[PDB]
C-alpha cells in the first residue's frame, strides 16, 4: 500500500549516499 | 555533478505519492 511505499522511500533516502 | 543527482532523486521520491 501508500504506507509502505513511504517507509520503503525513507529506507532508500537513507541509503542514498 | 553526482551531488545534484542524488539531490535530485530524492525530489523524485517525494514526487511518486
Ligand atoms: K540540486
Ligand atoms: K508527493
Given at each position: 500500500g501508500?504506507?509502505?511505499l513511504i517507509r520503503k522511500?525513507?529506507?532508500v533516502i537513507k541509503?542514498?549516499?
Open positions: 501508500v504506507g509502505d522511500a525513507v529506507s541509503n542514498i549516499v
